[PDB]
Write an enzyme that holds these catalytic residues in place. Structure first.
Site, PDB file in Angstrom:
ATOM      1  CG  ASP A   7      -1.642   1.312   1.519  1.00 30.95           C
ATOM      2  OD1 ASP A   7      -1.680   2.194   0.607  1.00 30.95           O
ATOM      3  OD2 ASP A   7      -2.219   1.448   2.625  1.00 30.95           O
ATOM      4  CE  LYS A  68      -2.048   7.130  -3.265  1.00 25.84           C
ATOM      5  NZ  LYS A  68      -2.336   6.092  -2.264  1.00 25.84           N
ATOM      6  CD  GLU A 173      -5.053   3.619  -2.467  1.00 24.25           C
ATOM      7  OE1 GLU A 173      -5.937   4.430  -2.092  1.00 24.25           O
ATOM      8  OE2 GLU A 173      -3.891   3.964  -2.774  1.00 24.25           O
ATOM      9  CG  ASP A 197      -9.145   4.523   2.501  1.00 22.94           C
ATOM     10  OD1 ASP A 197      -8.570   5.011   3.515  1.00 22.94           O
ATOM     11  OD2 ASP A 197      -8.538   3.919   1.596  1.00 22.94           O
TER      12      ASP A 197
END
Ligand code: AN2
Ligand code: CL
Ligand code: CL
Ligand code: CL
Length: 386
Positions: A7, A68, A173, A197
């Site tokens: 991850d 990211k 994800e 999430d």
């Protein structure tokens, strides 16, 4: 032959391995099961992970994080223009339009593409797995947000190749989180899964459907700027005002180092408040040599964050509306991301789903790596998790 699941998170990364049907999440050198997605450059060395995050407030300009948010983007994108206000490090556009992160390393100006910074985090995760296994690791499944476009996914894959990994596959994800809970192999009939999430910097809600081991992302929504860091900021803003009332109007916010040190203690107290009713925020010699101390109850933290917590349900209602389905049709609610440990958030989601217990058995900040590790084992020919 050995394949790991990674991850590659905005704020934290996690590496897992699935062997003999069982998934081990691998602790790093400091015993931490997740590793900050931070890279720092000093006069002598290049730090990655915990060591990079630990010296961030002492070396803000040369400590890179949030790569990211830049990976696979053109520097001119409006999201880069907006996000760069939150970065103490310099980002400029190259002639090819790609972002270039500028730091000083050993007294020299260096520039890196976002995928080079991410490759260093991936290399650290690869090494964390290698130290645990005592053998080199070459194959990996890496996860990305479901909304990541082709450019963002390809740049993530390139970061893997630069790190020395053979990327078996890039997967979503939310799908990785659902795979972690065995929801693809449970029941067989059609299942509507909601992945909630809430991490350190982003909030993603994804509605998935699963018929006969096949996951499909039906709808996604969220807020790319809502996460744990925003709840820490609510504590910081309160403490800044509390310091003013205690010390004749003195403003901690005028000193960026005082704010960073206060933020570090605010985040620690916030974590304590997930299992205790009270926590103490304490910074010795915070500003003007003045010591700062305050007690925060869970009720006060809930009050400061009340609107932000409640608003996490807006993207939940949006995905259900987009997918044309009622909340009563959701079979499983999976809690992912470190911020889902906040009791008030768990209670809000449970009440929204009419008392349905969310799936939170897997440490929420590990569920994506856990699912990626399962997928990595399956793609290596190991059918033991099935
Ligand atoms: N016990 C806890 N209570 C509240 N928040 C917690 C927590 N444990 C971790 N967190 C929060 O989780 C966020 C990190 O989430 P995580 O899922 O690991 O990272 P990421 N890269 O996916 O954003 C941080 O803001 C951190 O404060
Ligand atoms: Cl494997
Ligand atoms: Cl072992
Ligand atoms: Cl999918």
């Amino acid at each position: 032959e050995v394949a790991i699941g990674i991850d590659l998170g905005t704020t934290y990364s996690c590496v897992g391995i699935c062997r003999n049907g069982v998934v081990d999440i691998i602790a790093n050198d400091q015993g931490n099961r997740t590793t900050p997605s931070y890279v720092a450059f000093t006069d002598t060395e290049r730090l990655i992970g915990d060591a990079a995050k630990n010296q961030a407030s002492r070396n803000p300009e040369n400590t890179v994080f949030d790569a990211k948010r830049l990976i696979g983007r053109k520097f001119s994108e409006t999201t880069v223009q907006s996000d760069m206000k939150h970065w103490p490090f310099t980002v400029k556009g190259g002639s090819d339009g790609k972002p270039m992160i500028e730091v000083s390393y050993q007294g020299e100006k260096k520039t890196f593409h976002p995928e080079e910074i991410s490759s260093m985090v991936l290399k650290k995760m690869k090494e964390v797995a290698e130290t645990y296994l005592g053998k080199p690791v070459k194959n990996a499944v890496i996860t990305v947000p479901a909304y990541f476009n082709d450019s963002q996914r390809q740049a993530t894959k390139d970061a893997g190749a630069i790190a020395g990994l053979n990327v078996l596959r890039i997967i979503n994800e939310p799908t990785a989180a659902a795979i972690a809970y065995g929801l693809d192999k449970k029941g067989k009939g059609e299942q509507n899964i909601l992945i909630f999430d809430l991490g350190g910097g982003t909030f993603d809600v994804s509605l998935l459907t699963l018929e006969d081991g096949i996951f499909e992302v039906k709808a996604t929504s969220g807020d790319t700027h809502l996460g744990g860091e925003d709840f820490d900021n609510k504590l910081v803003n309160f403490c800044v005002q509390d310091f003013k009332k205690k010390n004749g109007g003195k403003d901690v916010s005028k000193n960026s180092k005082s704010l960073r040190r206060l933020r570090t203690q605010c985040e620690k107290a916030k974590r304590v408040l997930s299992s205790s009713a009270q926590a103490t925020i304490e910074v010795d010699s915070l500003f003007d040599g003045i010591d700062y101390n305050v007690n925060i109850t869970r009720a006060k933290f809930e009050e400061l964050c009340m609107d932000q917590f409640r608003n996490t349900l807006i993207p939940v209602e949006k995905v259900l509306k987009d997918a044309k389905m009622d909340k009563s049709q959701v079979h499983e609610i999976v809690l992912v991301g470190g911020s889902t440990r906040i009791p008030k958030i768990q209670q809000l989601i449970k009440d929204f789903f009419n008392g349905k217990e969310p799936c939170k058995a897997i440490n929420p900040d590990e569920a994506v790596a856990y699912g990626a590790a399962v997928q990595a084992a399956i793609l290596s020919g190991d059918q033991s998790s099935a």
